[PDB]
Scaffold this active site. Sequence first.
Site, PDB file in Angstrom:
ATOM      1  N   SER A  45       0.496  -1.347   0.165  1.00 19.68           N
ATOM      2  CA  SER A  45       0.058   0.220   0.034  1.00 19.68           C
ATOM      3  C   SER A  45       0.865   1.136  -0.055  1.00 19.68           C
ATOM      4  O   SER A  45      -0.046   2.742  -0.463  1.00 19.68           O
ATOM      5  CB  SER A  45      -1.110   0.027   1.222  1.00 19.68           C
ATOM      6  OG  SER A  45      -2.347  -0.944   0.719  1.00 19.68           O
ATOM      7  N   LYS A  48       0.603   4.163  -2.447  1.00 17.65           N
ATOM      8  CA  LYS A  48      -0.270   4.686  -2.654  1.00 17.65           C
ATOM      9  C   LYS A  48      -0.746   6.389  -2.794  1.00 17.65           C
ATOM     10  O   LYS A  48      -0.862   6.938  -3.421  1.00 17.65           O
ATOM     11  CB  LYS A  48      -1.940   4.334  -1.771  1.00 17.65           C
ATOM     12  CG  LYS A  48      -2.178   2.895  -2.146  1.00 17.65           C
ATOM     13  CD  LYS A  48      -3.386   2.779  -1.651  1.00 17.65           C
ATOM     14  CE  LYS A  48      -4.081   0.532  -2.221  1.00 17.65           C
ATOM     15  NZ  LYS A  48      -4.511   0.372  -0.585  1.00 17.65           N
ATOM     16  N   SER A 105      -6.041   2.865   3.341  1.00 19.28           N
ATOM     17  CA  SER A 105      -5.706   2.140   2.703  1.00 19.28           C
ATOM     18  C   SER A 105      -6.902   0.989   2.137  1.00 19.28           C
ATOM     19  O   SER A 105      -6.297   0.085   1.827  1.00 19.28           O
ATOM     20  CB  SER A 105      -4.651   1.215   3.466  1.00 19.28           C
ATOM     21  OG  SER A 105      -3.877   0.398   2.717  1.00 19.28           O
ATOM     22  N   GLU A 141      -4.767  -4.223  -7.615  1.00 23.82           N
ATOM     23  CA  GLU A 141      -5.290  -4.275  -6.078  1.00 23.82           C
ATOM     24  C   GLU A 141      -6.279  -6.033  -6.373  1.00 23.82           C
ATOM     25  O   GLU A 141      -7.047  -5.722  -7.682  1.00 23.82           O
ATOM     26  CB  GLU A 141      -5.993  -3.151  -5.679  1.00 23.82           C
ATOM     27  CG  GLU A 141      -4.831  -2.076  -4.542  1.00 23.82           C
ATOM     28  CD  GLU A 141      -4.009  -2.254  -3.736  1.00 23.82           C
ATOM     29  OE1 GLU A 141      -3.603  -3.901  -3.237  1.00 23.82           O
ATOM     30  OE2 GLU A 141      -3.301  -1.560  -3.702  1.00 23.82           O
ATOM     31  N   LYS A 209       2.731   6.391   5.837  1.00 22.08           N
ATOM     32  CA  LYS A 209       2.030   5.472   5.126  1.00 22.08           C
ATOM     33  C   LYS A 209       2.443   3.761   5.334  1.00 22.08           C
ATOM     34  O   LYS A 209       3.465   3.442   4.899  1.00 22.08           O
ATOM     35  CB  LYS A 209       1.496   5.489   3.382  1.00 22.08           C
ATOM     36  CG  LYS A 209       0.577   4.725   2.897  1.00 22.08           C
ATOM     37  CD  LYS A 209      -0.663   5.248   3.144  1.00 22.08           C
ATOM     38  CE  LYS A 209      -1.249   3.827   1.965  1.00 22.08           C
ATOM     39  NZ  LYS A 209      -2.234   2.542   3.066  1.00 22.08           N
ATOM     40  N   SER A 210       2.037   3.000   5.487  1.00 18.80           N
ATOM     41  CA  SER A 210       2.031   1.699   5.573  1.00 18.80           C
ATOM     42  C   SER A 210       1.540   0.153   4.429  1.00 18.80           C
ATOM     43  O   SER A 210       0.778   1.193   3.618  1.00 18.80           O
ATOM     44  CB  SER A 210       1.170   0.718   7.456  1.00 18.80           C
ATOM     45  OG  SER A 210       0.288   1.164   7.130  1.00 18.80           O
ATOM     46  N   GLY A 211       2.059  -0.837   4.693  1.00 18.89           N
ATOM     47  CA  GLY A 211       1.543  -1.658   3.560  1.00 18.89           C
ATOM     48  C   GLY A 211       1.420  -2.683   4.134  1.00 18.89           C
ATOM     49  O   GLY A 211       2.411  -3.002   5.416  1.00 18.89           O
ATOM     50  N   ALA A 212       0.844  -3.476   4.424  1.00 19.72           N
ATOM     51  CA  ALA A 212       0.683  -4.991   4.775  1.00 19.72           C
ATOM     52  C   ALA A 212       0.486  -6.195   3.129  1.00 19.72           C
ATOM     53  O   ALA A 212      -0.171  -5.567   2.444  1.00 19.72           O
ATOM     54  CB  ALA A 212       0.084  -5.349   5.756  1.00 19.72           C
TER      55      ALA A 212
HETATM   56  P1  LIG Z   1      -2.467  -2.590   2.279  1.00 20.27           P
HETATM   57  O1  LIG Z   1      -2.886  -1.884   3.549  1.00 20.27           O
HETATM   58  O2  LIG Z   1      -0.634  -2.519   1.636  1.00 20.27           O
HETATM   59  C1  LIG Z   1      -3.314  -3.580   0.825  1.00 20.27           C
HETATM   60  N1  LIG Z   1      -2.930  -5.176   1.084  1.00 20.27           N
HETATM   61  C2  LIG Z   1      -3.179  -5.726   0.851  1.00 20.27           C
HETATM   62  O3  LIG Z   1      -4.707  -5.847   0.553  1.00 20.27           O
HETATM   63  O4  LIG Z   1      -3.391  -6.637   1.511  1.00 20.27           O
HETATM   64  C3  LIG Z   1      -4.212  -8.164   1.721  1.00 20.27           C
HETATM   65  C4  LIG Z   1      -2.843  -9.444   2.205  1.00 20.27           C
HETATM   66  C5  LIG Z   1      -2.779  -9.152   2.975  1.00 20.27           C
HETATM   67  C6  LIG Z   1      -1.839 -10.632   4.021  1.00 20.27           C
HETATM   68  C7  LIG Z   1      -2.440 -12.059   2.965  1.00 20.27           C
HETATM   69  C8  LIG Z   1      -3.005 -11.801   1.683  1.00 20.27           C
HETATM   70  C9  LIG Z   1      -3.617 -10.636   1.196  1.00 20.27           C
END
Ligand SMILES: *P(=O)(O)CNC(=O)OCc1ccccc1
Length: 263
Positions: A45, A48, A105, A141, A209-212
């Site tokens: 993320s 973004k 996000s 996405e 801004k974070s991301g996962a």
């Molecule tokens: P952003 O907040 O980094 C959008 N991230 C995202 O859609 O993560 C989904 C995800 C995370 C972990 C495992 C599978 C899918």
Amino acid sequence: HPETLVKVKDAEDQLGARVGYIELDLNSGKILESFRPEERFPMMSTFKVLLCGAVLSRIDAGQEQLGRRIHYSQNDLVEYSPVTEKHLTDGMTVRELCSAAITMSDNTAANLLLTTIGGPKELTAFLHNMGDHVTRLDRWEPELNEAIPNDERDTTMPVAMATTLRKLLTGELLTLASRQQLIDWMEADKVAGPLLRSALPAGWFIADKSGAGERGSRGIIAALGPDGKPSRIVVIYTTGSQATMDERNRQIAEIGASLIKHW
Ligand SMILES: *P(=O)(O)CNC(=O)OCc1ccccc1
């Protein structure tokens, strides 16, 4: 400070994965500290912010307006879209979409905005034109968060993301009004509490801004500093860990703690 590097390396041992780190002086652009600065990590993320940077560029050139309303259907709704699911009937303005994409996000908001600028290929060209020849967006996405080992798609390098963020926030690329708008959205981020924010002293400024993503991927970009004014940019990325969300959140917060201590 080298003591922060000790913590970054310690995080690698704990998470059993690579951790990219960069500390940049916002004013001069000097690299203050770095760890794996030129290795690639999935943006997740964090892209973004770059997306909305490109959107604001078009607004400055009069090719786009903040108030323009965009309508969509539930066919456009993807995983994790808290704001867009609720505004399905009303639609949302470009301004509301960027706020949703950055502060919450919202994944669908990211996709909608991507379409307006020409998709991943255009965002990548936008970045290249401003001096970033490394950062690249390839997918939409949520596929862009796959983080397949050794895949160069949707990745950046700590030093590239750091310098690119500096250009957007303080360079002459965007107008004052737009630079301020971008930093305001970041300051209002509501989903980055466990990260750098939990180790920040009272009165400090932070726009982040974070991301996962998949495969233990986690990351965060930020402009922060004392007395309500940002003075540095910090970029932290990691991928490959089998650790839980809490554990990864803890390590990043600890790196933030060391960063503050030796400020
Ligand atoms: P952003 O907040 O980094 C959008 N991230 C995202 O859609 O993560 C989904 C995800 C995370 C972990 C495992 C599978 C899918």
